Amino acid sequence: QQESNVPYLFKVVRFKSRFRASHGDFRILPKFVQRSQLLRGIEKFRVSVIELEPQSFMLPHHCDGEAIFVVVKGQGVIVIAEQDKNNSFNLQKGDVLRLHGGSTIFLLNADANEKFKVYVLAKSVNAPGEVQEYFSAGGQNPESFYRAFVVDILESAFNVKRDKIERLFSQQKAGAIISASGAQAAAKAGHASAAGGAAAAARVAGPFNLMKEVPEFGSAFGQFQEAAPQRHVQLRDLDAAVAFMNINSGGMVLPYYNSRSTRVVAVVEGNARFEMACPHLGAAVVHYAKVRGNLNVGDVLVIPAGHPITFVAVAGSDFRVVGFGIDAEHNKKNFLAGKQNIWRNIDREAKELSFDMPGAEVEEIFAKQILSYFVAGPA
Numbered sequence: 001q002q003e004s005n006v007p008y009l010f011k012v013v014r015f016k017s018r019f020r021a022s023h024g025d026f027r028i029l030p031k032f033v034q035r036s037q038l039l040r041g042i043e044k045f046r047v048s049v050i051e052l053e054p055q056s057f058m059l060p061h062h063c064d065g066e067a068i069f070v071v072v073k074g075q076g077v078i079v080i081a082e083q084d085k086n087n088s089f090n091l092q093k094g095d096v097l098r099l100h101g102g103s104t105i106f107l108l109n110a111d112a113n114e115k116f117k118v119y120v121l122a123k124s125v126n127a128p129g130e131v132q133e134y135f136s137a138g139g140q141n142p143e144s145f146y147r148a149f150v151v152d153i154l155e156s157a158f159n160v161k162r163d164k165i166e167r168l169f170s171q172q173k174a175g176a177i178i179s180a181s182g183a184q185a186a187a188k189a190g191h192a193s194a195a196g197g198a199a200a201a202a203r204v205a206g207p208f209n210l211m212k213e214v215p216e217f218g219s220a221f222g223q224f225q226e227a228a229p230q231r232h233v234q235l236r237d238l239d240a241a242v243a244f245m246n247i248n249s250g251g252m253v254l255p256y257y258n259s260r261s262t263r264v265v266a267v268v269e270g271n272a273r274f275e276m277a278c279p280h281l282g283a284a285v286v287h288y289a290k291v292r293g294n295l296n297v298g299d300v301l302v303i304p305a306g307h308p309i310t311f312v313a314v315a316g317s318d319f320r321v322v323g324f325g326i327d328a329e330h331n332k333k334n335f336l337a338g339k340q341n342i343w344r345n346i347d348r349e350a351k352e353l354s355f356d357m358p359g360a361e362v363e364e365i366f367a368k369q370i371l372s373y374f375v376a377g378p379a
């Protein structure tokens with residue numbers, strides 16, 4: 001596994017900036033099928049990262065993809081402008097927001113020191129996997145799409161003399177993410193509901209955050225929390241989930257597999273060693289290829305459904321990731337070792353036949369791990 005050969009691994013440097021901005025960046029990973037047809041089952045999805053430096057503003061624009069924004073660091077204000085409604089939310093770490101495709105948005109990082117980072121999942125509605133940005137704001141740089149219209153049409157549309165309206169669209173030359181003044185920050189944020197306050201909603205609801213809830217799976221060595229479409233209606237159309245997994249330093253998540261959901265995992269903190277069992281790269285008779293590697297901040301690992309996987313935190317940091325789940329509804333985590341695992345639900349005689357060893361002996365071995373989900377890693 002020279003890593004560029006592991007098709008499920010997408011190193012951080014593979015994310016491509018969509019523009020050159022002074023106060024931040026917006027970078028997107030290539031289509032998942034760029035180097036392998038093994039990922040054709042998730043071809044319509046793209047993941048990206050939005051970074052805003054302190055005291056910055058990202059210009060109004062919309063995308064042709066249905067998105068889910070997850071704040072991984074800092075605080076920022078998102079304002080959404082529809083044809084007949086305005087919504088603004090003050091987002092914080094852990095917030096999850098479903099953004100309808102075609103929503104014109106702008107972002108503001110009002111903090112004086114901390115960067116605002118968002119991990120984004122988008123699903124195409126035009127050609128599979130193609131998601132583009134449409135800058136309504138802008139002029140020469142970023143180019144505003146209004147410049148695609150002839151001057152007589154702009155004049156008639158805006159009821160403004162052509163030279164004046166043309167001029168409006170050529171004043172901006174600073175780029176897509178620029179400096180915001182302290183006043184401007186106060187002004188643009190301020191109608192923004194701060195933990196959320198969706199409205200007593202219909203179309204665009206506010207963010208939700210699960211970081212204060214009890215983990216679905218947890219132990220002294222790690223935690224797993226997930227926003228499922230079963231619980232959050234805003235995620236049903238995309239049939240996506242947003243998972244948060246943290247493995248404490250020196251810990252590991254016990255081998256497990258997802259029953260039907262493919263996960264696009266992005267590292268937000270730390271480092272980890274991963275090992276996955278893949279029958280495709282390996283395998284008439286089936287053979288499981290040992291797909292392994294190391295993950296660093298910003299890297300992405302796609303975990304296909306049904307594939308056994310384990311992550312081992314390395315060095316002196318907890319290892320934290322945000323995972324987007326595709327085909328999420330009805331997905332179940334199946335652990336392969338630990339007190340709570342699938343073998344708890346397999347009878348003794350079946351274990352004996354499974355491993356050609358006395359059933360009580362197989363059970364004795366499977367009961368040695370008294371902990372579940374996350375345990376101390378090798379050392």
Ligand SMILES: O=C1CC[C@@H](C(=O)O)N1
Pocket residue numbers: 048061062063064065066067105120122131133
């Ligand atoms: O689909 C996407 C890509 C970028 C993000 C946005 O509109 O900022 N939505």
Ligand SMILES: [Mg+2]
Pocket residue numbers: 020021022023024025
């Ligand atoms: Mg930049």
